[PDB]
Design a protein around this ligand. Structure first.
Ligand SMILES: Cc1nnc([C@@H]2O[C@H](CO)[C@H](O)[C@H](n3cc(-c4cc(F)c(Cl)c(F)c4)nn3)[C@H]2O)n1-c1cc(Cl)ccc1C(F)(F)F
Length: 138
């Protein structure tokens, strides 16, 4: 097992064709999950499934620069289920991050932070148990 919050180092940051794979299980009474692609204390890409925001399931994606959150990107397609195993894949593409859950494409998030090499850490937090987190260039 892996400790949560988990820090997956990205020495030399993200680069196109980098495939990050995370394997785990959502906890039985999960409230939220978060992946944080960090550039120091800024968050180039925050991917946040909320099991209950205003009584609705939603994935909120955003960038935090200099302590302030920008323009939220929201989507109602929500494949995570409490108590069930998951596989998240994040494929870094030239102009966006592609996100797939359990081999099904979920969403993409266009790069706001364009200096990709400075996005040096992936924080993985929230209501999950984690078994694997790594990346391979494809
Ligand atoms: C309203 C509102 N309700 N939530 C948010 C923030 O929305 C952001 C996206 O826009 C991030 O999701 C922030 N966030 C979530 C977490 C996290 C997630 C986890 F799952 C865990 Cl486990 C964990 F510990 C931590 N840390 N920071 C979250 O606090 N905002 C919001 C939205 C905007 Cl655009 C601007 C300002 C706010 C503010 F926070 F000030 F209120």
């Amino acid at each position: 097992p892996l400790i949560v919050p988990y820090n997956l180092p990205l020495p030399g940051g993200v680069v196109p064709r980098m495939l990050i794979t995370i394997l785990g299980t959502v906890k039985p009474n999960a409230n939220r999950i978060a992946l944080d692609f960090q550039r120091g204390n800024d968050v180039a890409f925050h991917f946040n499934p909320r099991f209950n925001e205003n009584n609705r399931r939603v994935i909120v994606c955003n960038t935090k620069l200099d302590n302030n959150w920008g323009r939220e990107e929201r989507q109602s397609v929500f494949p995570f289920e409490s108590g069930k195993p998951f596989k998240i894949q994040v494929l870094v593409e030239p102009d966006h991050f592609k996100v797939a859950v359990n081999d099904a494409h979920l969403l993409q998030y266009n790069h706001r932070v364009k200096k990709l090499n400075e996005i040096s850490k992936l924080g993985i937090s929230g209501d999950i148990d984690l078994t694997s987190a790594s990346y391979t260039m494809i």
